Amino acid sequence: RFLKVKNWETDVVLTDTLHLKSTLETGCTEHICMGSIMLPTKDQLFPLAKEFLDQYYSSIKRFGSKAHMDRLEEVNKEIESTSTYQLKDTELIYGAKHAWRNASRCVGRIQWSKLQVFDARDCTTAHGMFNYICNHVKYATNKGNLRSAITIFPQRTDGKHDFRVWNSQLIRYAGYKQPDGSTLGDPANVQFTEICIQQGWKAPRGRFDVLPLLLQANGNDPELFQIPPELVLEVPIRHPKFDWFKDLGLKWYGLPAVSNMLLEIGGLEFSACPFSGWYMGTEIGVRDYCDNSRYNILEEVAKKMDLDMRKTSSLWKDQALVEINIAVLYSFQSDKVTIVDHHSATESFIKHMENEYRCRGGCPADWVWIVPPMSGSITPVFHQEMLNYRLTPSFEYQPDPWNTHVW
Amino acid sequence: RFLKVKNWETDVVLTDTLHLKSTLETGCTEHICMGSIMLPVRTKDQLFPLAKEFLDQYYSSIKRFGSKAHMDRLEEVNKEIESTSTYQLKDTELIYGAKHAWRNASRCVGRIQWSKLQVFDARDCTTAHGMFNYICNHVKYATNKGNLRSAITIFPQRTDGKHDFRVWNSQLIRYAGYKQPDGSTLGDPANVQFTEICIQQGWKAPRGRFDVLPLLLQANGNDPELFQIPPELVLEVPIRHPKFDWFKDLGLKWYGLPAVSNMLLEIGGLEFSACPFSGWYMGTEIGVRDYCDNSRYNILEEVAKKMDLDMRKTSSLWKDQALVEINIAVLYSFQSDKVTIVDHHSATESFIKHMENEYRCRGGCPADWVWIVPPMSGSITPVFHQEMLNYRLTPSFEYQPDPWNTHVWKG
Ligand code: HEM
Ligand code: HEM
Ligand SMILES: C[C@H](O)[C@H](O)[C@H]1CNc2nc(N)[nH]c(=O)c2N1
Ligand SMILES: C[C@H](O)[C@H](O)[C@H]1CNc2nc(N)[nH]c(=O)c2N1
Ligand SMILES: CCSCC(=N)NCCC[C@H](N)C(=O)O
Ligand SMILES: CCSCC(=N)NCCC[C@H](N)C(=O)O
Ligand SMILES: [Zn+2]
Numbered sequence: 001r002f003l004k005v006k007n008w009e010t011d012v013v014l015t016d017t018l019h020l021k022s023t024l025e026t027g028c029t030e031h032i033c034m035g036s037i038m039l040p041t042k043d044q045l046f047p048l049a050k051e052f053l054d055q056y057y058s059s060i061k062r063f064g065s066k067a068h069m070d071r072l073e074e075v076n077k078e079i080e081s082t083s084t085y086q087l088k089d090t091e092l093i094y095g096a097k098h099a100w101r102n103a104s105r106c107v108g109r110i111q112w113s114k115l116q117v118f119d120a121r122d123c124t125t126a127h128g129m130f131n132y133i134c135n136h137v138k139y140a141t142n143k144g145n146l147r148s149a150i151t152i153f154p155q156r157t158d159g160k161h162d163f164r165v166w167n168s169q170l171i172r173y174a175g176y177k178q179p180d181g182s183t184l185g186d187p188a189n190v191q192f193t194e195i196c197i198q199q200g201w202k203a204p205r206g207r208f209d210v211l212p213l214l215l216q217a218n219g220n221d222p223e224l225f226q227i228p229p230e231l232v233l234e235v236p237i238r239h240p241k242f243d244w245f246k247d248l249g250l251k252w253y254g255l256p257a258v259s260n261m262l263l264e265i266g267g268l269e270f271s272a273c274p275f276s277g278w279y280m281g282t283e284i285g286v287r288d289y290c291d292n293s294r295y296n297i298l299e300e301v302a303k304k305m306d307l308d309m310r311k312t313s314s315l316w317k318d319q320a321l322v323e324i325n326i327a328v329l330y331s332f333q334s335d336k337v338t339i340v341d342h343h344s345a346t347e348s349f350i351k352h353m354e355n356e357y358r359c360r361g362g363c364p365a366d367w368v369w370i371v372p373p374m375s376g377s378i379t380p381v382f383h384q385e386m387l388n389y390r391l392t393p394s395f396e397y398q399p400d401p402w403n404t405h406v407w
Numbered sequence: 408r409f410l411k412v413k414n415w416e417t418d419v420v421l422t423d424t425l426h427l428k429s430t431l432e433t434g435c436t437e438h439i440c441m442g443s444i445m446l447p448v449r450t451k452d453q454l455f456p457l458a459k460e461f462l463d464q465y466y467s468s469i470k471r472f473g474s475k476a477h478m479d480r481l482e483e484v485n486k487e488i489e490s491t492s493t494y495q496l497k498d499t500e501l502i503y504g505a506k507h508a509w510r511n512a513s514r515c516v517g518r519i520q521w522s523k524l525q526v527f528d529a530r531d532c533t534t535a536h537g538m539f540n541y542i543c544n545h546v547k548y549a550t551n552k553g554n555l556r557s558a559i560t561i562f563p564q565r566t567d568g569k570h571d572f573r574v575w576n577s578q579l580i581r582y583a584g585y586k587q588p589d590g591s592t593l594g595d596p597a598n599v600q601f602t603e604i605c606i607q608q609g610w611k612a613p614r615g616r617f618d619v620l621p622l623l624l625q626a627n628g629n630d631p632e633l634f635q636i637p638p639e640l641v642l643e644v645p646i647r648h649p650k651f652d653w654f655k656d657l658g659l660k661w662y663g664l665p666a667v668s669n670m671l672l673e674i675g676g677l678e679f680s681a682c683p684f685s686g687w688y689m690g691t692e693i694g695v696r697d698y699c700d701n702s703r704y705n706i707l708e709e710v711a712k713k714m715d716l717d718m719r720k721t722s723s724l725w726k727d728q729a730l731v732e733i734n735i736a737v738l739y740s741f742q743s744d745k746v747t748i749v750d751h752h753s754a755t756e757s758f759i760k761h762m763e764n765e766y767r768c769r770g771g772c773p774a775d776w777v778w779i780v781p782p783m784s785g786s787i788t789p790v791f792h793q794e795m796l797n798y799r800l801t802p803s804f805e806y807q808p809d810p811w812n813t814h815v816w817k818g
Contacts, residue, residue, distance in 0.1 A: 008445060009702050019439055028435035028442070032426050033797035035435070035442030036776035038415065281722075286786055293416050298787065312752040313690075313738045315731055318784045322727045329722045343721035367443035368776060373791060375727045377695050377782030378707070388440040 007350075009383035014354070016387050018362025023051075024390030035388065036368050039397060042083055048267025049075050049085060052393070056094055084157065086121075087265065093117045095265030096150050099393040100275075105369040107345050107381070108277050110352035111148055115275075116140075118151040126215040126223040129153065129163070129272070133213060136274065137170060137231050141255050144233065146278040146338040152263065153272035154218075163272035164401045166195065166214035166222050170257035170274055171232055174209040185209065187293055195402055199224055208234075208251055216272075221407060235335050239327040244304055248297070252284045252328070254337040262398040271398060278338040280345045285325035286373045297324070321374060342372035346379035353384070364389045412794035414759075421763065423796050425771025430460075431799035442797065443777050446806055448568040449676065451488055457676030458484050458494060461801065464507075465500050493566060495530075496674060502526045504674035504802045505559050509684070511800040514778035516754055516790075517686050519761035524684075525549075525558040532562050535624040535632040538572065542622060542683065543640060546579060549685045550642050550664055555747035559684035563627075564677045572681035573810045575623035575631050577601065579666040579683055580641060583618040594618060596702055604811055608633050617660055625681075625810060630817050644744050648736040653713055657706065661693050661737070663746040671807040680807060687747040689754045694734035695782045706733065730783055751781040755788040762793070773798045 003016040027040025034040050050072060057068040078085040087095065101112045116139070120132045136151040153163035168189070175183060175190035183190065185207050193211065197203055201212050201224055210232050216222035233254040239245035257276035262269060289297050298320050302309055305323065307316040332339035340348075349370065356363035365386035376382045410423040434447025441447045459481060466477040487494040496504065510521040525548065529541045541560050549558040562572040577598070584592055584599040592599065594616050602620065606612055610621050610633055619641050625631035642663040648654035666685030671678055698704050707729050711718055714732065716725035741748035749757075758779065765772035774795035785791045 003439075006445065009700065022438045025437045026435070026440045028433070028437065028440045030432045030436060031429050031798055032410070033433045033435045033440065033442045033775075035440045035797070036793075036795045037412070038794065290787055291416065291792075313742065313750040315735050315738070315750070317752065317787050318731045318734070321784060321787055322724055322731055325727070326724050329724070333722065341722040341724065343726065366440075371785070373786030375730060375783050376780070376785050378699060378726050378730055382782060383700075385445060386443045388442070389438060 003387055005385035005387060007380075007384045009380060012354075014357040016357070016362040018360055018364070018391070019387055019389045021391060022364075022389040023392050024394070026388060026390060035366070042079055045084070045267045046076060046079055048392075049079065052095065052266030053091075055098075056091055059094065084155070084268070087268065089119060092119060092121075092152065092265070095393040096152065096263065096273075099263050099265065099395050100150075102364060102391040102394050104364040104366040104388050104390075107280065107349045107370050108340075109363075110348045110355075111277070114148060116147060116149040118149065120151050120153050121155070123153050123163070124218060126217045126220070126225070129165070129215040129217055130213060130225040133165075133170060133215075133274065134228060134231055136276070137227065137255065137257070140257070140276045141231065141233050144254065144335065144337040146255065146276075148275075148277050150263075150273060150275035152270050154270075156269040156271055161219040162216065162401075163218065164216040164222070164405075165259040165272050165274055166216065166401055167192065167211060168258070168260045170213070170259050170276070171227070171253045171255055172211050173207075174203060174211050176203070176205055186288075186295065196224065207249070210253070216401065216405070222401075222405070233337060235331050235337055237327050237331045238334075239323065240330045242304070242323065242327075245327055248300065248304075250289070250295075250297070250327075252279075252288065254279075254332070256283070260398070260400070261395045263393070263395055265393040273395075275395075278340065279332070280340045280342055280372070281325055281329045281332075282342045282372045282374055285328035286321060289324055289328075290321060325374065342375065342379055346370075346372065346381040350380050350384060362387070364391060410796060412796055414789075414793050416789060416792040419763070421766040423766065423771040425769055425773070425800075426796055426798050429773075429798040429800060431801070431803070433798065442775075448565075449678075451492055454493070454676045455485060455488055457801070458488065461504070461675030462500070465503055468503060493564070494675075494677070496677065498528060501528060501530075501561065501674070505561065505672065505682075505684075507800075508672055508674070508802040508804050509559075511773065511803050513773040513775040513797050513799070516689065516758045516779050517749075518772075519757045520557055520686070523557060525556060527558060527560040529560050529562045530564070532572070533627060535626045535629070535634075538562065538574070538624045538626055538681070539622060539634040542574070542579060542624075543637065545683065545685070546636065546640050546664060546666070549666065550640065553642060553663065553744065553746040555664065555685075555687040557684075557686045559672075559682055561672065561679050562681035564679050569815075570628035571625065571810075572627065573625040573631070573814075574668040574681050574683055575601070575604070575625060575810050576620060577667070577669045579622065579668050579685065580636065580662045580664055581620050582616075582662075583612060583614075583620050585612065585614055595697075595704065605633065616658065619662070625814070628815075630814075631810075642746065644740050644746055646736050646740045647743075648732060649739045651714075651732065651736075654732075654736050657709065657713075659698070659704075659706070661697065663688070663741070663748075665692070669807070669809070670804045672802070672804055674802040682804075684804075687749070688741070689749050689751055689781070690734055690738045690741070691751050691781045691783055694737035695730065698733055698737075699730060734783065751784065751788060755779075755781065755790040759789045759793060762795075771796070773800060 005014050027034040057063050075085045096117050097115050140149045173186040174193040175185045175187050212224045212226045214222045237250035259274035262271050263273040289295050302316050302320040308314045309316050353363050366388045367386040370381050413420050434441035466472045484494050505526050545560045582595040583602040584595040622634045623631045643660050646659035668683035671680050672682040698706050711725045711729035717723040718725050762772045775797045776795045779790050
């Protein structure tokens with residue numbers, strides 16, 4: 001019931017008590033560990049509300065005050081009468097910051113308290129959502145000096161009136177099946193590109209087409225909008241020594257903005273809540289460029305470097321991988337777009353972990369996601385034991401809406 | 408209950424039923440995952456079920472379940488347990504059991520080979536000098552002049568827990584570590600404690616960077632005794648790089664035979680607390696961890712210096728660049744001297760084939776993702792993209808406390 005985590009590089013031992021406030025379920029049992037699996041009424045709502053308000057008032061040091069008791073009463077009345085309730089601005093801001101604080105898969109949480117929250121609960125239409133999103137994008141991009149942000153659309157009501165951003169990120173490249181048999185662009189986005197085209201998008205059928213937004217307001221059919229091109233900051237990829245690297249024609253976008261998740265605060269569900277930070281280099285260089293199922297560029301880069309590809313043991317994949325990641329970091333830095341390398345990011349998160357153990361008594365962390373997808377053991381997180389558990393407020397996955405939406 | 412695991416690169420979905428046969432617990436609950444935690448005297452009453460369970464598995468494996476020979480062996484073990492409170496494995500059951508502990512080892516990426524294990528039965532051993540002889544034979548057989556062969560040597564099982572056989576070394580061959588008065592370490596810092604014990608026991612330490620430790624051996628619960636492995640039996644590889652001629656002047660070498668000697672083998676309820684086993688290396692074990700961990704030989708700085716990398720900013724990825732070159736050097740060196748080694752691409756690809764085959768033939772393959780994925784270049788290996796289920800099957804290899812913490816000294 002009191003848990004120890006050891007760092008095997010420093011022998012530093014931390015005690016976790018925070019997990020005893022864990023609410024949701026991990027997917028594991030005492031017989032089976034599922035730690036590597038990607039996706040493991042009025043009655044229910046009031047304990048959820050109480051639980052959240054109790055943590056809020058405790059956080060502002062007014063636990064058990066008349067203002068605490070009165071708000072609990074007020075929310076209680078509002079649920080009994082309206083079957084839902086409304087968060088105050090202060091509660092909304094706190095809930096969002098804490099959903100990020102609690103995000104066990106995010107290595108960037110040292111920044112959690114600096115989140116800029118945009119309250120879009122007054123939004124009613126898809127055009128309104130489009131306006132709010134462009135403002136988020138411009139505010140967060142900030143001409144390269146990226147700032148964390150979240151934009152929060154109206155909460156779920158009866159689930160017939162859901163706000164959804166159909167895109168998985170605000171900014172992504174299209175993917176196209178070809179006559180050829182191969183795939184043009186980002187293969188991760190093929191099906192959603194199909195949803196766009198069949199809703200009316202004119203696709204330019206290129207390698208790096210920024211997808212249009214597909215926005216659903218109040219449970220209505222979603223609508224298309226193109227993000228103003230001038231708000232989509234992109235970086236051409238060059239290498240500081242390989243002059244030929246630019247010839248690959250590679251680019252990426254500056255703003256990582258996950259848009260398909262659901263924010264749960266005090267039992268309330270915010271199904272459209274796009275949020276954004278800034279990239280750790282490996283995300284693009286290792287995953288987006290090198291996954292066999294993504295742009296899968298390792299072979300081409302290796303060929304240009306004139307490496308011996310005859311045998312896996314020459315570590316040619318590994319050599320090319322490093323150089324690709326050097327090029328990503330270099331290119332963002334040259335153009336002054338915020339980016340973090342995996343050494344600096346993991347080092348930060350270790351400091352965040354210690355802070356959180358000292359000030360909060362724990363920090364839920366999914367080791368499988370936190371350890372970078374290259375050079376794992378030369379980053380300190382590799383040697384850090386982590387406990388994974390589910391605290392609320394939280395960001396949760398949710399079904400893709402085209403599987404659900406009734407047209 | 409069927410459990411599905413998905414590969415996110417290939418969209419292959421597999422179905423696990425094997426997990427239903429799981430007995431032991433993981434450390435995880437519905438409320439907490441401890442998947443990254445390194446480490447999360449029996450009764451007659453508890454012994455016969457474990458015996459029975461194991462022998463039902465044995466007799467099923469050989470297609471003789473419910474045979475007269477199966478029933479007779481149950482009755483005989485039952486009677487032996489009641490009369491003597493323990494029981495002896497037949498040779499065949501011991502072989503089968505040891506193979507299966509390997510097969511069930513969820514942190515082992517080398518399991519495609521599980522069926523080819525050479526088992527040396529050392530249950531007639533009575534003394535530390537006897538153990539030493541068994542261990543030299545194992546090292547020489549397994550080395551095979553660089554063409555490595557998997558092997559396990561099995562010493563007598565636990566009885567009352569007061570007469571345990573133990574190998575006090577953590578591997579049969581490992582380098583000494585010496586803490587210096589200035590706080591620096593010479594040699595391998597992982598082995599400082601065990602080295603200090605060896606010196607206290609009377610080993611004359613050469614005190615260099617790569618001194619092969621003496622075997623420290625406990626038989627039948629007695630105080631352990633020191634033995635030097637004959638040097639001619641210790642195959643080592645000097646490390647050089649195919650393109651960088653200064654690489655050899657770092658003075659690096661490593662030993663070719665990895666042989667874990669500190670784990671406990673459980674078969675049918677019985678505890679074999681000395682069962683050293685050995686295979687061959689995957690290159691990253693040496694080039695990533697043994698060489699580049701901060702708490703091990705820690706050579707990354709010195710290497711990147713010699714490479715003239717830009718070291719002022721981590722964002723040049725100098726560490727990642729040096730790491731690759733060291734790993735190329737390790738693999739090149741072993742291959743040039745014809746010592747068995749496997750690269751991390753080749754090993755993980757093999758494991759993925761092994762895992763699929765295991766699902767089809769056995770209904771599962773317990774695997775620990777945290778351990779299986781290599782400590783460099785994770786996502787360009789297919790295992791990174793493979794969902795896995797971790798659970799504990801018997802027979803199994805288990806951790807056990809270090810013997811110097813529990814041993815009752817006789818003097
Ligand atoms: C500010 C700089 C930030 C950095 C450097 C960062 C870093 C990362 C990284 C590397 C991942 C892994 C993503 C992947 O592998 O696909 C991740 C995941 C995640 N992050 Fe952050 N993050 C930042 C900001 C934020 C913000 C502002 C939020 C929420 C307000 C957030 C919440 C999450 C969540 C929920 C995940 C898991 C998403 C999923 O499961 O796909 N992050 N983060
Ligand atoms: C045939 C060649 C083999 C290869 C390539 C191989 C590969 C590996 C690797 C890379 C590890 C991780 C080691 C670490 O990080 O310290 C490991 C662990 C392990 N292997 Fe294998 N292995 C082989 C043979 C065997 C054999 C013969 C056995 C037993 C009969 C075995 C049982 C285990 C066990 C129990 C572990 C976990 C050790 C621990 O928890 O410290 N392996 N293996
Ligand atoms: C099967 C496995 O869980 C899957 O490949 C995970 C592993 N770790 C990850 N880690 C991060 N940060 N992002 C990912 O998409 C993944 N994928
Ligand atoms: C805390 C963490 O589990 C620890 O560093 C693990 C991670 N994965 C590992 N994987 C292997 N193969 N070997 C190890 O020693 C470790 N160390
Ligand atoms: C937006 C909250 S977390 C910020 C981040 N750094 N990454 C998010 C995911 C981006 C994805 N892995 C990609 O490579 O596009
Ligand atoms: C002996 C059974 S598993 C064989 C193996 N390939 N590795 C064992 C551990 C070796 C350790 N990592 C080292 O670097 O010495
Ligand atoms: Zn688990």
